[PDB]
Subunit: 148 residues, 5 copies
């Protein structure tokens, strides 16, 4: 099984999001040896992920795309508007291009800084990165059956 995966990661709070990418790339290598290679693409924020996924999806080069970002909802500013536009936009792109788009765009409830939490979120994203790899593998596999 040989295919490429585009992983789009937002850079706001890159220290957290990076945990997921590292985790994701690792597991993928463990589980496939290296016959599945992952190309990384940086993007300013979550809001730039959908158009980037659509562009990349359109190239025909990837079997799946992952968009990861940490969207901290809460503070003086309402941020859920963005999270909604982004998760919905990703759904829209995959329905339109027919390339699976997996989401590692996490939105905590109203977390609130400190080595207390910082370690919580770093742990959590490491986990979600592993899960993401398992899903990516599984959905690619499953689609190539379902269409044969």
């Amino acid at each position: 099984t040989s295919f490429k995966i585009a992983f789009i990661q937002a850079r706001w709070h890159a220290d957290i999001v990076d945990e997921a990418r590292k985790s994701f790339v690792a597991e993928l290598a463990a589980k496939t040896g290296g016959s599945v290679e992952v190309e990384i693409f940086d993007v300013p924020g979550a809001y730039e992920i959908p158009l980037h996924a659509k562009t990349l999806a359109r190239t025909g080069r990837y079997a799946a795309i992952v968009g990861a970002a940490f969207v901290i909802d809460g503070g003086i500013y309402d941020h859920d508007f963005v999270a909604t536009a982004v998760i919905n936009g990703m759904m829209q792109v995959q329905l339109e291009t027919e390339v699976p788009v997996l989401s590692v765009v996490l939105t905590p409830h109203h977390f609130h800084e400190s080595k207390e939490h910082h370690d919580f979120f770093h742990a959590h994203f490491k986990v979600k990165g592993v899960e993401a790899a398992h899903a990516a593998l599984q959905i690619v596999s499953e689609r190539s059956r379902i269409a044969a």
Copy 2:
């Protein structure tokens, strides 16, 4: 009569989602004898369901598709964004392909683990599986009356 149904089930919490598939298949068999056959498709999570339904729908092979997942909203992480993208997504796929997509993608309010609840949710999903079979049958039948 005779036609096929694709049943897409998400694997996160499979132990609960399974109850719905079992019950759905069963009732379908009882009520039709066997003239309506159900093909099962696995998928990592809820978010993977819309594109899978669109791909399966576009094959012409099914009179109806059922998407079933358990989306536990609540915890440190906001999970409603995904439930929304998925329930809206399924709606969008059926409108675009014109193959009915029924939902058994359930989102409890903020359930909280323990043989207490676990039996509640296993029960509820078994029921929703039966209702879903009656719904599937009734909608396919009703559409073929309109249509012609």
Copy 3:
């Protein structure tokens, strides 16, 4: 002289029925019978948008009505469906250009008993009459600006 497709969900049929009954009657009173209504049953609210689109695509109807009772509240979040449906109906009408009227009602968190049951039956009877006046009015208004 024209047809109206009335799509009614069957979950809680006892309540939705009030609306249809009411709708049909008023429609007969106000027009005589030159506007006929065809009824379509559907398992739940979620089945209404595709049904509306299919019917709207036939060219037979001047307007479609989707009626259902979507009880939001309980251990399960139900607003996701209410949302997909009301939005879906808007989407259908924008795409097909046949008016779709909504009698898809979502109470706040009603809670059973002859107390409420009579409340909701009354309310749906009213909404059904309003719905008929609306259907007549919009069909009429569109044929002018058309």
Copy 4:
């Protein structure tokens, strides 16, 4: 500085919505003399506004469309679903037909009747009607400059 505007007003609570239309038409008259004429169209409720706007927009006759309605959210019944379909629907229509659609579809938080409030809302809508006219003029003008 001479064009037409379609004003779509919902009739539920017409007593309130009407304030907005009156005010809108007046200000438009004052600020333009009369070279900008407004055609009014009635519609049952807010839910009927997007398809009407699409139809009217697609005629080519109007430089802008205004949908106005009062959507009372709150009571035993959840009403926000409709407000969302409508405000989103108007956005969709303008994106698709490229004729500006301005919103005077107002949703108070959970107002609660009485000469107390009735005068509040009548006032507010008269205000939003004026603002709407300024907006209308400004956006039509701005578009004809840039593309």
Copy 5:
């Protein structure tokens, strides 16, 4: 590199929004010398931003578009409906025209006037303006690579 950016600012509360445009233009000049020029467009409210973005995007002239508005959610009137149509609308536009659209459409939680807050919001918008500039540059660059 050398390309143009359309900056669409809403005029309601212009005193605050302006802070962001000022800041955005500056940082862009600082960081690029002047090889990247910004064209400003005024619009009544936030709700007028997506169509404007779409029209400007369709001209071919711009590498990116920025929409900036202050949407004060809260008061007797629900305002989130608009915020939602606008941010979703901008996302839609960029998906359809494929010209990046950046958002500086901010909605505070329920701020409440006074030199106390006024300076808070003016400060915050100045900051988001700088960030927007860095984002604009970065996404234009990154797209021309892929």
